Design a protein around this ligand. Structure first.
Ligand code: FHR
Ligand code: FHR
Lengths: 301, 301
């Protein structure tokens, strides 16, 4: 066995979620050591959302204006600061459940798990991918801001995303744990286009390699193609151009299955030019691109 | 917002997973209080898998033949017992991270989160549904046995599934936390048919209600139908018969959206009789049935 979207265990992150209240606005924060990270638009009221001056708004706020609650515990704020679009509230007590972590800015096409939280309490976890346009197709309601995306390797939690806002198309935009927005998006109430949503070609191929491993093989053909020939049939369907680095990324899967990478591209070429004819690949009627060449290997071990 | 499969936070369950070793076989166990639950086929060697006599095999095992490790900790077994197809290893130390739990046998059509574990360490979490044929379409490799499915309500963890084996069709079969297999499946190495895989009609309708909430509305029509008329067009496509209880289950969503239940059935009837014509509903090209009328409400709050 089976194959399906699988998220990392959320235990390591549940212990770092807290409630942040700045006046009327309430959202979630990340408690790591003696610091709490949250979106900086907490200081925004209701009439300061079109084009707020976070510098001026932050000057009118003091330490006692921020209330952090790790459950029923009350953390004291002994210092605040604004790094890019994130607020760093220095607290007096260090999180006793702080895991080995690190802030990383993922690349477009990589996956990560999201722990959706409301009022500081986790609600659910699901897998997401950093779309080429630097957006994420997630599920967030009002109050979900502050939720983070993370990757768990061995025992080190790698935080890479913090939710900030939604876009008119329904997709979501956020920043890394250093306050740097992913994409050209800004934290101001205004319509912002995310751009054309391209398909992660390398992930689709990895999803096809996982298919041949699980028994789905009807798409395999007697055909082959060149890298330039495939990229020409991929630009028409809005597929990211496949590079030689992508081929080497899929190397382990190729030798694992015995199907050359360029042969997989030939199968994908026909799928894009002729559809699926009602068939199903790993239980899906469409080509999935949110499975990296690394999620398949760790799930098809 | 957005809509997608979302699992419960796995923190409460990660603290209850342990490694169980009975000779050469090694799998996962559930540590709750001073008892460890695991599949009873741990006592099986390699030549006792076709039709093993668990009574006789268990008589040849003593307490010191079972080794439990909660990470690097070593739990002592002071008593063992066999309840149905599950082993209850009484340990000397009670789990300090035991959450408020309860063993429940879910019904066909209900959903639950699965925490896939290998060697006692959690690997990932994903949402699953109890198929009408009493199987689950999950993702398990060798050593995944002992992993459990759970539902988290407020602060009470409701365990409802423990993985035992895979079927020839790739689907998986397991038991409740009392050792009772879901379906007519038995824990013996033999080909076992799971039966026709019916579609959870009530879940598909709830998935359509969630669609209208998120903006997907092209499937809504000027048509309506009767309950018997819909059930007749559903038996041909292997859809579970819709009952009045199902209608009342969808009541809150109906009043929430203003679309009568029988009107939704009319839209589903055309979708089954005419397909999707290449469109997409909530990012899917097929009709999803693993979203209960209760997962949509808690995700579309
Ligand atoms: C965080 O708590 C929410 C998350 C939203 C709620 C609905 N779904 C989500 O993903 N964030 C917001 O509501 C932001 C708050 C703003 C405060 C002032 C600074 C900018 C962010 N707003 C938006 O997400 C927002 C505003 C807006 C205007 C026009 C089109 C879309 C749009 N989205
Ligand atoms: C648990 O550790 C595994 C889980 C499997 C491994 C591959 N994917 C899974 O979901 N369980 C097994 O391997 C069982 C072990 C048996 C021990 C003796 C008692 C019965 C279970 N076996 C099977 O899952 C199994 C045997 C078998 C024979 C014929 C067709 C299918 C089939 N599946």
């Amino acid at each position: 066995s089976g194959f399906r979207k699988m998220a990392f265990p959320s235990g390591k992150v549940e212990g770092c979620m807290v409630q942040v209240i700045c006046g009327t606005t309430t959202l979630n924060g990340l408690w790591l050591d003696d610091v709490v990270y949250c979106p900086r638009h907490v200081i925004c009221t209701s009439e300061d959302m079109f084009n707020p001056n976070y510098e001026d708004l932050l000057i009118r706020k003091s330490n006692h204006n921020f209330l952090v609650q790790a459950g029923n515990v009350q953390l004291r704020v002994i210092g605040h600061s604004m790094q890019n679009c994130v607020l760093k509230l220095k607290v007096d007590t260090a999180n006793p459940k702080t895991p080995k972590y690190k802030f990383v800015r993922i690349q477009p096409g990589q996956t990560f798990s999201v722990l959706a939280c409301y009022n500081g309490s986790p609600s659910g976890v699901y897998q997401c991918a950093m779309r080429p346009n630097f957006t994420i197709k997630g599920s967030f309601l009002n109050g979900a801001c502050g939720s983070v995306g993370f990757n768990i390797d061995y025992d080190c939690v790698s935080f890479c995303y913090m939710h900030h806002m939604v876009l008119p198309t329904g997709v979501h935009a956020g920043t890394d744990l250093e306050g740097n927005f992913y994409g050209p998006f800004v934290d101001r109430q205004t319509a912002q286009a995310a751009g054309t949503d391209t398909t992660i070609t390398v992930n689709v191929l990895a999803w096809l390699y996982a298919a041949v491993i699980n028994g789905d093989r009807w798409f395999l053909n007697r055909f082959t193609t060149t890298l330039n020939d495939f990229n020409l049939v991929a630009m028409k369907y809005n597929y990211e151009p496949l590079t030689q680095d992508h081929v080497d990324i899929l190397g382990p899967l190729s030798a694992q299955t015995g199907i050359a990478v360029l042969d997989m591209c030939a199968s994908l070429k026909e799928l894009l030019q002729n559809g699926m004819n009602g068939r199903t690949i790993l239980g899906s009627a469409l080509l999935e691109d949110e499975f990296t060449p690394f999620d398949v290997v760790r799930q098809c071990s």
